[PDB]
């Protein structure tokens, strides 16, 4: 078949293509997201659209089921495979044990398969990561994240992509209990997180909220433009 060692342990203890893969995620698109008691919200940016091309082909957000939604970063080619993979596993958790799928179970499948995808011969590690957002059964929130090494980990807020340190710095004033005490405020909270993110031009920004078990609805640049208007108006009233 195809037998070759792709990744080996260096004498410093750090692997090569694994830790180096994180640089591709730093050089990918920027994406954000938050969790809440009712409506969870995600984010995406750095689409680099020429406004003359259809947005559904460049779409960075998919979903396995109406309960659990998929969000990735980095290069899309390697994410396609992870998607279809996770679709088969989600459909198996549906098949046997008919209860809805838990983020802890599914993301663990992505991380495990990616781990052995960094172990066996003839397997080149992915240079991308992702973070999954949804709402747990019984109205609870649920989110987790992926890692090149396959380490699942749950955040209170999503900061990745180009300038992850910069956005994560802004989340320090986000974790206040007031934010977000309201879903109406959570949306504008994503616009306020994306305002310090990337160019923050109000065009490439795309977000979808999921309230309880209700499926998310992608908003057209109509309500997001009014939310930008109220952002600059909040900076106006703050003077």
């Amino acid at each position: 078949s195809y037998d070759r060692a792709i990744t080996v342990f260096s004498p410093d203890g750090h692997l090569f293509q694994v830790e180096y893969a994180q640089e591709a995620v730093k050089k990918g698109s920027t994406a954000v997201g938050v969790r809440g008691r009712d409506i969870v919200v995600l984010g995406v940016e750095k689409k680099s659209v020429a406004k003359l091309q259809d947005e559904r082909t460049v779409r960075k957000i998919c979903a396995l089921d109406d309960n659990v939604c998929m969000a990735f970063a980095g290069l899309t080619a390697d994410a396609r495979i992870v998607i279809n993979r996770a679709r088969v596993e989600c459909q198996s958790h549906r098949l046997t044990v008919e209860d809805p799928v838990t983020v802890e179970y599914i993301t663990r499948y992505i991380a495990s398969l990616k781990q052995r995808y960094t172990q066996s011969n003839g397997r080149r590690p992915f240079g991308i990561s992702a973070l999954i957002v949804g709402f747990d059964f019984d109205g609870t929130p649920r989110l987790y994240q992926t890692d090149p090494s396959g380490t699942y980990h749950a955040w209170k807020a999503n900061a990745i992509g180009r300038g992850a340190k910069s956005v994560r710095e802004f989340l320090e004033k986000n974790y206040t209990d007031e934010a977000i005490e309201t879903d109406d405020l959570t949306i504008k909270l994503v616009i306020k997180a994306l305002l310090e993110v990337v160019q923050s031009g109000g065009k490439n920004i795309e977000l979808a909220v999921m309230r309880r078990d209700q499926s998310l609805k992608i908003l057209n640049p109509e309500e997001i433009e009014k939310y930008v208007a109220e952002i600059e108006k909040e900076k106006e009233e703050n003077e």
């Binding site: 078949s1 195809y2 037998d3 070759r4």
Partner: protein
């Protein structure tokens, strides 16, 4: 399975060019000249086989190896790699003739063969063929002339040439061969252009002339070979 390494030995150059395949093109240029002409009724191919010593007999080894009764073929480049794809195409036409019970189209041979050949360039741990095939035949009343290459591309020419001085010969075939002429003229200008780069000796054993009639391919004997060209061209 060998051990089954199967890693492609051909990288993509910074300019997008292929390494081993362009070198194989050098092996095609360093081969032997072979011309062909598609005009009117059928296709006429003219190869060249010269012996390095007087002890050699050309009644044994044949350069023209027809794959089908109505489909002939010649080549340029090294011979060893030629024999390979010969036996290949022989086993390759038989599935078509077995399923469909119908003579396979010349254009079908090319696609099947060049697909396996292109895979032979992408297959890991093995070098491409250094042979550029000239494929002919008559199908559906309209005969055909195709030319292959180590990378596997395929073309269609009225009159083409391979081997040394093929760029010089090509300008000759352009001006001297045009429109459509009978198979007799097709033989004539073929032998003239072959006598361009040939030595000062022309015998029935120095070259061979293959012809695809619409009645099907017939390999001419050295007798007629020296009968038309004696008195060459």
């Amino acid at each position: 399975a060998e051990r089954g390494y199967s890693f492609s030995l051909t990288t993509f150059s910074p300019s997008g060019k292929l390494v081993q395949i362009e070198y194989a093109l050098a092996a095609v240029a360093g081969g032997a000249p072979s011309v062909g002409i598609k005009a009117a009724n059928g296709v006429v191919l003219a190869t060249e086989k010269k012996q390095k010593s007087i002890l050699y007999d050309e009644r044994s080894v044949h350069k023209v190896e027809p794959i089908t009764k109505h489909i002939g073929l010649v080549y340029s480049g090294m011979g060893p790699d030629y024999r390979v794809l010969v036996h290949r195409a022989r086993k390759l036409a038989q599935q078509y003739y077995l399923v469909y019970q119908e003579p396979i189209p010349t254009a079908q041979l090319v696609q099947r063969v060049a697909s396996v050949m292109q895979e032979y360039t992408q297959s890991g741990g093995v070098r491409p063929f250094g042979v550029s095939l000239l494929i002919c035949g008559w199908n559906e009343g309209r005969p055909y002339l195709f030319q292959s290459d180590p990378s596997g591309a395929y073309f269609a020419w009225k009159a083409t040439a391979m081997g040394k001085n093929y760029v010089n010969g090509k300008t000759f075939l352009e001006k001297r061969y045009n429109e459509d002429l009978e198979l007799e003229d097709a033989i004539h200008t073929a032998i003239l252009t072959l006598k361009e780069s040939f030595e000062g000796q022309m015998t029935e054993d120095n070259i061979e002339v293959g012809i695809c009639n619409e009645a099907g391919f017939r390999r001419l004997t050295p007798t007629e070979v020296k009968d038309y060209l004696a008195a060459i061209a």
